[PDB]
Write an enzyme that holds these catalytic residues in place. Sequence first.
Site, PDB file in Angstrom:
ATOM      1  N   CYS A   1      -4.282  13.079  14.105  1.00 13.60           N
ATOM      2  CA  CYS A   1      -4.240  12.037  13.587  1.00 13.60           C
ATOM      3  C   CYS A   1      -4.415  11.340  14.733  1.00 13.60           C
ATOM      4  O   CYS A   1      -3.634  11.614  16.003  1.00 13.60           O
ATOM      5  CB  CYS A   1      -3.362  11.312  12.989  1.00 13.60           C
ATOM      6  SG  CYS A   1      -3.674   9.608  12.383  1.00 13.60           S
TER       7      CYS A   1
ATOM      8  N   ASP B   1       4.398  -0.402  12.707  1.00  9.77           N
ATOM      9  CA  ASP B   1       3.556  -0.580  11.685  1.00  9.77           C
ATOM     10  C   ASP B   1       3.547  -2.454  12.391  1.00  9.77           C
ATOM     11  O   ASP B   1       2.511  -2.359  12.031  1.00  9.77           O
ATOM     12  CB  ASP B   1       3.338  -0.979  10.000  1.00  9.77           C
ATOM     13  CG  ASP B   1       3.506   0.878   9.885  1.00  9.77           C
ATOM     14  OD1 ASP B   1       2.256   1.509  10.720  1.00  9.77           O
ATOM     15  OD2 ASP B   1       3.404   0.948   8.277  1.00  9.77           O
TER      16      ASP B   1
ATOM     17  N   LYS C   1       1.271  -1.243   0.446  1.00  9.97           N
ATOM     18  CA  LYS C   1      -0.625  -0.032   0.134  1.00  9.97           C
ATOM     19  C   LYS C   1       0.585   1.053   0.076  1.00  9.97           C
ATOM     20  O   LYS C   1       1.020   2.583  -0.631  1.00  9.97           O
ATOM     21  CB  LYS C   1      -1.444  -0.183   1.182  1.00  9.97           C
ATOM     22  CG  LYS C   1      -1.625   1.178   1.567  1.00  9.97           C
ATOM     23  CD  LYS C   1      -2.216   1.232   3.421  1.00  9.97           C
ATOM     24  CE  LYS C   1      -1.634   1.443   4.127  1.00  9.97           C
ATOM     25  NZ  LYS C   1      -1.673   3.523   4.282  1.00  9.97           N
ATOM     26  N   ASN C   2       2.032   1.046   1.132  1.00  3.29           N
ATOM     27  CA  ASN C   2       3.055   2.104   0.768  1.00  3.29           C
ATOM     28  C   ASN C   2       3.787   2.535   0.278  1.00  3.29           C
ATOM     29  O   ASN C   2       4.583   3.674  -0.274  1.00  3.29           O
ATOM     30  CB  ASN C   2       3.292   2.365   2.178  1.00  3.29           C
ATOM     31  CG  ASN C   2       2.262   2.830   3.590  1.00  3.29           C
ATOM     32  OD1 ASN C   2       1.112   3.177   2.916  1.00  3.29           O
ATOM     33  ND2 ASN C   2       2.753   2.284   5.213  1.00  3.29           N
TER      34      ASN C   2
ATOM     35  N   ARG D   1      -8.412   0.163   4.780  1.00  2.00           N
ATOM     36  CA  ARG D   1      -7.451   1.003   4.711  1.00  2.00           C
ATOM     37  C   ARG D   1      -6.824   0.282   4.506  1.00  2.00           C
ATOM     38  O   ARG D   1      -5.441   0.429   3.158  1.00  2.00           O
ATOM     39  CB  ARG D   1      -7.537   2.363   5.336  1.00  2.00           C
ATOM     40  CG  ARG D   1      -8.824   3.387   4.965  1.00  2.00           C
ATOM     41  CD  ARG D   1      -8.225   4.217   6.299  1.00  2.00           C
ATOM     42  NE  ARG D   1      -6.905   4.786   6.320  1.00  2.00           N
ATOM     43  CZ  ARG D   1      -7.139   5.936   6.514  1.00  2.00           C
ATOM     44  NH1 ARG D   1      -7.288   6.477   7.492  1.00  2.00           N
ATOM     45  NH2 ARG D   1      -5.442   6.240   6.237  1.00  2.00           N
TER      46      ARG D   1
ATOM     47  N   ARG E   1       1.531  14.197  14.352  1.00  2.00           N
ATOM     48  CA  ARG E   1       2.741  13.940  13.007  1.00  2.00           C
ATOM     49  C   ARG E   1       1.995  15.628  12.690  1.00  2.00           C
ATOM     50  O   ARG E   1       1.526  15.350  11.187  1.00  2.00           O
ATOM     51  CB  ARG E   1       1.308  13.199  12.182  1.00  2.00           C
ATOM     52  CG  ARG E   1       1.556  11.145  12.503  1.00  2.00           C
ATOM     53  CD  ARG E   1       0.681  10.360  12.316  1.00  2.00           C
ATOM     54  NE  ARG E   1       0.625  10.515  10.760  1.00  2.00           N
ATOM     55  CZ  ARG E   1       0.774   9.036  10.649  1.00  2.00           C
ATOM     56  NH1 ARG E   1      -0.103   8.742  10.342  1.00  2.00           N
ATOM     57  NH2 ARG E   1       1.544   9.189   9.382  1.00  2.00           N
TER      58      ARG E   1
HETATM   59  C1  LIG Z   1       2.176   6.561   3.658  1.00  2.61           C
HETATM   60  C2  LIG Z   1       3.077   6.100   4.080  1.00  2.61           C
HETATM   61  O1  LIG Z   1       4.015   5.806   3.589  1.00  2.61           O
HETATM   62  N1  LIG Z   1       2.781   6.184   5.847  1.00  2.61           N
HETATM   63  C3  LIG Z   1       3.541   6.251   6.472  1.00  2.61           C
HETATM   64  C4  LIG Z   1       5.010   6.715   6.890  1.00  2.61           C
HETATM   65  O2  LIG Z   1       3.820   7.729   7.896  1.00  2.61           O
HETATM   66  P1  LIG Z   1       5.531   9.290   7.188  1.00  2.61           P
HETATM   67  O3  LIG Z   1       3.982  10.154   8.384  1.00  2.61           O
HETATM   68  O4  LIG Z   1       5.536   9.285   6.235  1.00  2.61           O
HETATM   69  O5  LIG Z   1       6.198   8.748   8.997  1.00  2.61           O
HETATM   70  P2  LIG Z   1       7.185   9.722   9.018  1.00  2.61           P
HETATM   71  O6  LIG Z   1       7.077  10.947   8.470  1.00  2.61           O
HETATM   72  O7  LIG Z   1       8.400   9.371   8.794  1.00  2.61           O
HETATM   73  O8  LIG Z   1       6.951  10.209  10.721  1.00  2.61           O
HETATM   74  C5  LIG Z   1       7.938   9.420  12.202  1.00  2.61           C
HETATM   75  C6  LIG Z   1       8.050  10.435  12.806  1.00  2.61           C
HETATM   76  O9  LIG Z   1       8.085  12.329  12.925  1.00  2.61           O
HETATM   77  C7  LIG Z   1       7.558  13.263  12.759  1.00  2.61           C
HETATM   78  N2  LIG Z   1       7.638  13.857  11.906  1.00  2.61           N
HETATM   79  C8  LIG Z   1       7.512  13.279  10.472  1.00  2.61           C
HETATM   80  C9  LIG Z   1       7.399  14.403   9.617  1.00  2.61           C
HETATM   81  C10 LIG Z   1       7.030  15.484   9.767  1.00  2.61           C
HETATM   82  O10 LIG Z   1       7.275  17.019   9.415  1.00  2.61           O
HETATM   83  N3  LIG Z   1       6.859  15.997  11.027  1.00  2.61           N
HETATM   84  C11 LIG Z   1       7.837  15.326  12.385  1.00  2.61           C
HETATM   85  O11 LIG Z   1       7.726  15.285  13.036  1.00  2.61           O
HETATM   86  C12 LIG Z   1       6.436  12.112  12.877  1.00  2.61           C
HETATM   87  O12 LIG Z   1       4.573  13.072  13.591  1.00  2.61           O
HETATM   88  C13 LIG Z   1       6.356  10.716  13.985  1.00  2.61           C
HETATM   89  O13 LIG Z   1       6.615  11.141  15.049  1.00  2.61           O
HETATM   90  O14 LIG Z   1       5.928   6.160   7.593  1.00  2.61           O
HETATM   91  C14 LIG Z   1       5.683   5.338   8.636  1.00  2.61           C
HETATM   92  C15 LIG Z   1       6.464   4.815  10.108  1.00  2.61           C
HETATM   93  O15 LIG Z   1       7.006   3.572   8.972  1.00  2.61           O
HETATM   94  C16 LIG Z   1       4.070   4.513   8.855  1.00  2.61           C
HETATM   95  O16 LIG Z   1       3.967   3.997   9.809  1.00  2.61           O
HETATM   96  C17 LIG Z   1       2.613   5.262   7.903  1.00  2.61           C
HETATM   97  O17 LIG Z   1       2.042   4.455   7.840  1.00  2.61           O
HETATM   98  C18 LIG Z   1       0.398   4.882   7.968  1.00  2.61           C
HETATM   99  C19 LIG Z   1       0.229   3.730   9.435  1.00  2.61           C
HETATM  100  C20 LIG Z   1      -0.046   4.328   6.800  1.00  2.61           C
HETATM  101  O18 LIG Z   1      -0.056   3.119   5.651  1.00  2.61           O
HETATM  102  O19 LIG Z   1      -1.366   5.279   6.489  1.00  2.61           O
END
Ligand SMILES: CC(=O)N[C@H]1[C@@H](OP(=O)(O)OP(=O)(O)OC[C@H]2O[C@@H](n3ccc(=O)[nH]c3=O)[C@H](O)[C@@H]2O)O[C@H](CO)[C@@H](O)[C@@H]1O[C@H](C)C(=O)O
Length: 417
Positions: A116, A303, A23-24, A395, A121
């Site tokens: 969320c 995940d 999916k991702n 989803r 996030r």
């Molecule tokens: C579409 C998709 O690929 N989504 C995935 C991706 O979301 P992402 O949002 O990019 O993950 P992050 O940016 O690596 O978030 C990691 C940490 O970094 C902080 N952060 C992130 C960006 C920012 O600008 N500022 C900031 O502070 C944040 O709050 C988090 O605590 O990576 C996550 C971790 O592996 C997955 O759990 C998530 O799956 C989900 C469930 C799903 O399938 O829907």
Amino acid sequence: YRDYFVIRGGKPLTGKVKISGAKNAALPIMFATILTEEPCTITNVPDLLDVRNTLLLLRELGAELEFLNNTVFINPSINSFITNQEIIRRMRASVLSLGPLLGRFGRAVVGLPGGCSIGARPIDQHLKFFKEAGADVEVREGYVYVNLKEKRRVHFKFDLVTVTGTENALLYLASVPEESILENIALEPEVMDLIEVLKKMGAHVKVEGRSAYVKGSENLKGFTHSVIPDRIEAGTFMVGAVLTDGEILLENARINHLRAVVEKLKLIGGEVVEENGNLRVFRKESLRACDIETQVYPGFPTDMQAQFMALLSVAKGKSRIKENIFEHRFHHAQELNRLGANITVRGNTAYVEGVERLYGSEVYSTDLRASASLVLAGLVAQGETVVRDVYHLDRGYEKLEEKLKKLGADIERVSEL
Ligand SMILES: CC(=O)N[C@H]1[C@@H](OP(=O)(O)OP(=O)(O)OC[C@H]2O[C@@H](n3ccc(=O)[nH]c3=O)[C@H](O)[C@@H]2O)O[C@H](CO)[C@@H](O)[C@@H]1O[C@H](C)C(=O)O
């Protein structure tokens, strides 16, 4: 909708299961089509709600497309650069439309995600990258207005590792006809899959350590691609085999995207044997406690955290599970406690004191990936477990209940508006 599952526990999972496409990986790769005017074909795309919502967004943006037999056929005739708030509220990953739209039009208007259930996030890193790229960024009416006067090379270092932040940056840089550099990027398999697609389109991308060197192009081509298998779905069924003391054979998964997961699974008592590309999974030793810390890939995936917590809820001993990624991601711990688990939560760390058995009851899904832990627990809990709001699971997984049923799970879905 209010559909729910009824799981009557007590059966070992046994047999084969075919793992779906990631999916991702499909999401960012679909957004990459915005970068070209040429037709693209994407196969091994799972039929699940996030994919359907992404396709809806692309149609809203002007694309003509079809989704048949897990294959997306798209004519990227994009004629708009506004990603509305409604779509963003439905799936915050729609923010991935920002980099491509900017690369194509020099401007974009994308709704800003709200909080969320997994956490606040914020996307400060995405916005910080675009500012560093020279774009004018302003938030008004709950939308991020981005305007680019001219494309120029960029050298940006992420303050923290972010998966979609890295993807959004790569999508934009792929359209810039200059040599750019990203530091401290995410290395997740899905990011690597998106990178192959951007190269197929004509961009040059070199990954060394956590640095990415990019050379983009203003005449990107169409592409044909088969997305990588979903490692989170794969890990979930692996956990299911070990938890239920069954024996399953995963088809179409990739052992090379599962190192940290297999490692922890074996420490707990499970076994994974590769047969060609297939993975045979079963319980080798009695279940025992294990400490787990989530980390960015290649470390243990956030995940997969909930799923292992369910497995550990019935292991011997006290396990420590710490979140370094989504520190707030523990709603499932208390739902598992409703099944008789003995889990405590202190800040970003959960402690699981294994119990002899679980007792089925009603639990609520709230996380498209983590809530699979509730379905897993329901497989072994005494009696019946009702998993509400499976819309979340729809989803995140393709035909989850059908695959489990095929493995012997006494599960059923009740459709409820
Ligand atoms: C579409 C998709 O690929 N989504 C995935 C991706 O979301 P992402 O949002 O990019 O993950 P992050 O940016 O690596 O978030 C990691 C940490 O970094 C902080 N952060 C992130 C960006 C920012 O600008 N500022 C900031 O502070 C944040 O709050 C988090 O605590 O990576 C996550 C971790 O592996 C997955 O759990 C998530 O799956 C989900 C469930 C799903 O399938 O829907």
